[PDB]
Design a protein around this ligand. Structure first.
Ligand code: 5VL
Length: 156
């Protein structure tokens, strides 16, 4: 997809020039060793002063041939404990759905910062996983204890 590949090259150029500290976003490779702009390996650092602090959370960003008509699928690998992350690892976020808040102009930086924001502020009106959501609603202290354990587990 010429349109997708052209935009992804622009995203890569912009990201390399200016990106938030501690974040990573790099295209993967094809079997022949060439760059695969359709599949990116990324990492989001937990925000300082939050229960996520010190964690580095890996996720994959997968683009469809019609990007930027469609948002990428963003998937934590491995899956994370969080009310808006499906058990598969897929992130549930309004800007990541075409018929909700996705706009073609949204950048990879905006996506990764949006997901970082989501990590520390769940949206209780769109639960994606039963366990983290139930704990978040029933016992915030227990919820944060689980989050801190997870951040420690994913410390670099
Ligand atoms: O290991 C990483 C280090 C830095 C950024 C991303 C990854 C990664 C992200 C998703 C899937 C695999 C991966 O290796």
């Amino acid at each position: 997809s010429g349109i997708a590949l052209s935009r992804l090259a622009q995203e890569r150029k912009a990201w390399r020039k200016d990106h938030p500290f501690g974040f990573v976003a790099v295209p993967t490779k094809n079997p022949d060793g060439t760059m695969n702009l359709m599949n990116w390996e990324c990492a989001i650092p937990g925000a300082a002063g939050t229960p996520w602090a010190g964690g580095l959370f890996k996720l994959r960003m997968l683009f469809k041939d019609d990007y930027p008509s469609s948002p990428p699928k963003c998937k934590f690998e491995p899956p994370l404990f969080h009310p808006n992350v499906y058990p598969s690892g897929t992130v549930c976020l309004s800007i990541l759905e075409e018929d909700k808040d996705w706009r073609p102009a949204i950048t990879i930086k905006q996506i990764l910062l949006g997901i970082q924001e989501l990590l520390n502020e769940p949206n209780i009106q769109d639960p994606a996983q039963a366990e983290a959501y139930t704990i978040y609603c029933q016992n915030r202290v227990e919820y944060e204890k689980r989050v801190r354990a997870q951040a420690k587990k994913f410390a670099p």
